[PDB]
């Protein structure tokens, strides 16, 4: 299949209570494998899957400066963005970052990506072609011409076509025996009876990886939105992923309903009736 | 600025059998900004030493974070997942539902 | 790894 490789950073500045709290997470598909948190006593890239372990000290001690250097561009930043909406020195606010690369199956560049966020909104995002930036408002255009300026697509489109994916390549080699894995679901369906005239049918899938799976109720073959409830796909805490649909149905018609699953690790879709 | 209210799952990571070791999770996400309480109850009281993953956020930029706890299920103990948040006019309690 | 930033 294809991969990506992500990375999340959180900033919050937290006025009179010391510099911002940053958090940076590092994903191979839906596998975190590494953290920082300037709030922990180690101030280093820590390692938060096995594969990684194995990288040496300069890969630690790299990776380490980086993105202490990130969290003090981005401190900087909060104090910039406050300027830039008028907004008071005593309230909180977040900056946010998402970057990363898809490989295709041949390990080959897809597509990269850059976005960042202020207060939980769009602020600036780099451009599919990776050489052009789209700014939310009249505050990212000041940030956008500042980049135009000093050339900043150019760095990240580097980055992204080079380091990112040679990396992403190695990271899936390293972990081939957990990266490379389709768990798929293990399904099963509930009945509990709400009244005399309705009951309701839960469909399971547990134990799943990767995270994207679709369940869906049909009546009659026909897809089922009313009276249905899908929950969103949460983490078991053991790197699978877990969720239910449910349908309310008329009693005595329990039969005529049926859940259909779809998942990368299932040869064909499964279809799970109520069983007797 | 825009705030949004935490979605809150508390599940076990297996299915859940009387006497059994598992885990109770209390899932938060769709949230922001990232500031959070969340405290895992054993019949209405505080469990100590719950952990929680590192912080990350969603395509639209809400936050979420997974609250877990080693537990042994039994037929009498009930079990809650409890979040305060900026968004929050109240303590928001999910009561854990074994098929749920 | 990492990205290898220019002010906001």
Known sequence: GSHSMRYFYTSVSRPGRGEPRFIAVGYVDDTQFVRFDSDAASQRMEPRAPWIEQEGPEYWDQETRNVKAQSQTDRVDLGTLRGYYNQSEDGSHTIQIMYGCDVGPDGRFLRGYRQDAYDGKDYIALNEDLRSWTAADMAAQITKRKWEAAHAAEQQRAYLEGRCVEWLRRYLENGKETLQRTDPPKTHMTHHPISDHEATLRCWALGFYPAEITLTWQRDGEDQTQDTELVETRPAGDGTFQKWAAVVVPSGEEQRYTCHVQHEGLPKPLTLRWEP | ?100 | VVVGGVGK
């Open chain 2, 1 to 100: 600025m825009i705030q949004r209210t935490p979605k809150i799952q508390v599940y076990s990571r297996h299915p859940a059998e009387n006497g059994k070791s598992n885990f109770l999770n209390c899932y938060v996400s769709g949230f922001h900004p990232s500031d959070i309480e969340v405290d895992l109850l054993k019949n209405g009281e505080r469990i100590e030493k719950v952990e929680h993953s590192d912080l990350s956020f969603s395509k639209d930029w809400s936050f979420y974070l997974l609250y877990y706890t080693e537990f042994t299920p039994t037929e009498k103990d009930e079990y809650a997942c409890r979040v305060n948040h900026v968004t929050l006019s109240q303590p928001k309690i999910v009561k854990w539902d074994r098929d749920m």
